[PDB]
C-alpha cells in the first residue's frame, strides 16, 4: 500500500478518477484516514517532477479535496512546504488549486484538529 508503488501502477494505465479511488482502498486494508500516508503530499511530489504538472495528479488532488474526509490543512501545509519558485507552470497550477477550495475552510471534527487548522492557515 506504499504511496509511490500504487501511484506508479495507477499512472502506467490511464484510469478514471473514481477507479483510482476505488482501487486505492483495495490496495491497503488499513487506511488510517490518510494521516500517516500523507496522500495529498505524495501527489504533489509526483506533480512537481515534470516541467509541466500533469493534469491527472491535479484531478486526483481535486477529488481528494472534494471528499470531506480529507482535511484542508494537510494540503495547505504540503503546498507551503514546496515553494522554491522554479517556474511559472507549477505556481499557476498551485494558484488554481488553492483558488478552487478556498473561501469555505469548513472543518468538522475535534477541537485539536481546528487548532491544527489555525496553525496550517
Amino acid at each position: 500500500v506504499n504511496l509511490k508503488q500504487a501511484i506508479l501502477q495507477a499512472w502506467k494505465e490511464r484510469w478514471s478518477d473514481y477507479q483510482w479511488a476505488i482501487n486505492m482502498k483495495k490496495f491497503f486494508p488499513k487506511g488510517a484516514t490518510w494521516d500517516i500516508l500523507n496522500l495529498a503530499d505524495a501527489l504533489l511530489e509526483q506533480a512537481m517532477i515534470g516541467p509541466s504538472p500533469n493534469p491527472l495528479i491535479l484531478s486526483y488532488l481535486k477529488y481528494a479535496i472534494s471528499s470531506q474526509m480529507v482535511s484542508y490543512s494537510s494540503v495547505l501545509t504540503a503546498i507551503s512546504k514546496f515553494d522554491d519558485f522554479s517556474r511559472d507552470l507549477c505556481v499557476q497550477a498551485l494558484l488554481d488549486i488553492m483558488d478552487m477550495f478556498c473561501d469555505r475552510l469548513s472543518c468538522h471534527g475535534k477541537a485539536e484538529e481546528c487548532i491544527g487548522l489555525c496553525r496550517a492557515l
Partner: protein, 157 residues
C-alpha cells in the same frame, strides 16, 4: 325487545333521577343477597429503531452542529461501500412526529458541481427523488442514494 318492553318503559320513565340508584338498590338487593349469599371478595424511539435496523453500509449519527434534543433532528451520513467511490455526506433533517410524514433532503448544489461524475450523480438523484412516492422513510432514501451512486458509476464505465 320482545318479553322485556315493560322493563325498558320503566327504566326510561325513571332515568336521570337523583334517587334512581337508591330505588334500584332498595328494590333489588335483598333477594339477590339471600339467594346467593355474600358478594365477591429528545430522540424518538422510531428513529433509534430504524437506525438500529439499517444495513452496515451506513453509520449515520447526530450532526455536530445545529440544535438537538428536539422534535426536529439533524443527521449526517457517510457511505462505506467497497464497490463504490466516495460522495458528499448527504445530510438530512427529520421533523417532529416522523411517522405519517416524510423527511426532506437539504440540497447543496455547489458541493456536487465542478465534476461530470458528481453532477451526473446529482441529476440522477433529482430524478429518483422526484420518482419517490409520498410518506417515504429515510432508509428508502439512503438505499436510493446507494443505488443512484451505483447507477452513475455503471454509466460512467
Amino acid at each position: 325487545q320482545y318479553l322485556c318492553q315493560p322493563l325498558l318503559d320503566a327504566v326510561l320513565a325513571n332515568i336521570r333521577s337523583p334517587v334512581f340508584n337508591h330505588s334500584l338498590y332498595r328494590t333489588f338487593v335483598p333477594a339477590m343477597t339471600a339467594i346467593h349469599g355474600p358478594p365477591i371478595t429528545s430522540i424518538p424511539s422510531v428513529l433509534q429503531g430504524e437506525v438500529a435496523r439499517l444495513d452496515p453500509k451506513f453509520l449515520v449519527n447526530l450532526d455536530p452542529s445545529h440544535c438537538s434534543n428536539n422534535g426536529t433532528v439533524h443527521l449526517i451520513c457517510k457511505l462505506d461501500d467497497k464497490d463504490l467511490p466516495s460522495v458528499p455526506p448527504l445530510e438530512l433533517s427529520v421533523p417532529a412526529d416522523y411517522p405519517a410524514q416524510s423527511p426532506l433532503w437539504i440540497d447543496r448544489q455547489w458541493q456536487y458541481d465542478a465534476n461530470p461524475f458528481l453532477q451526473s450523480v446529482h441529476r440522477c438523484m433529482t430524478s429518483r427523488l422526484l420518482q419517490l412516492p409520498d410518506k417515504h422513510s429515510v432508509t428508502a432514501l439512503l438505499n436510493t442514494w446507494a443505488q443512484s451512486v451505483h447507477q452513475a458509476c455503471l454509466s460512467a464505465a
